[PDB]
């Protein structure tokens, strides 16, 4: 696995290692995933004592904001030990009341009652034989009024990209080859379809997509030009080969959002 120590090296403090939203345009990075996990909760809804499910926790950002600005009640999932242990451990240090528990633990195996969902770029790692199941489950957790904040990357098809003008160059596929062959995401994402029509068919309403695919590519700009900047501390922590590679992978997503290849949204799903 890729220490902590490396992601260090370019993350905020926040931990969060999914898409950003410069609200303002002179935002740091930190403000910036501060601004992208309240503009999710804020679609939800939360009053404090609520009970919050984050799928796909991460090193724990999302949750800690939850507690910290919301007062909610957390539960955090995934199946990362590393994602595990830093979330374990933000969340005890938190002061407070409220429960905030992270579980190494897959949603397929989460079967309690909560009042919100949210998740941030988990969905598009998912199987796409779990897809109707995730959305079912999903609803079966929830209240009657519930709502879930489902942030997703997504891709479109060569015919799609053609209406828009866009075509797929022998860069871009070899681009997808280098994704899938090594240990980055992007590779076989689902289409918008995919999770607008199983998340209709499991009962849920979509009230709201927002697109943030231009904030995936300043985000992703702005972790290069923090690991490039601590190019020699990434080598020593990992090896000149992990670095080219995480800095291929980031500046080719930055150049493949700004193209309009793919997408990433959040989707405001209720019932």
Known sequence: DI??????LFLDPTWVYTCAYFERDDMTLEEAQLAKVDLALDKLNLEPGMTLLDVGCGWGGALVRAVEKYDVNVIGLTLSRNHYERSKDRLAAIGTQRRAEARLQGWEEFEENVDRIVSFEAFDAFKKERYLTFFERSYDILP?????????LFTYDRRWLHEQGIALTMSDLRFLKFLRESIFPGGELPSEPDIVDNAQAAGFTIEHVQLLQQHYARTLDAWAANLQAARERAIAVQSEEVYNNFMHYLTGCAERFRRGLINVAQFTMTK
């Open 144 to 152: 009657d009024d519930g709502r879930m904040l489902l942030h997703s």
């Open 3 to 8: 220490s902590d120590d490396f992601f260090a």
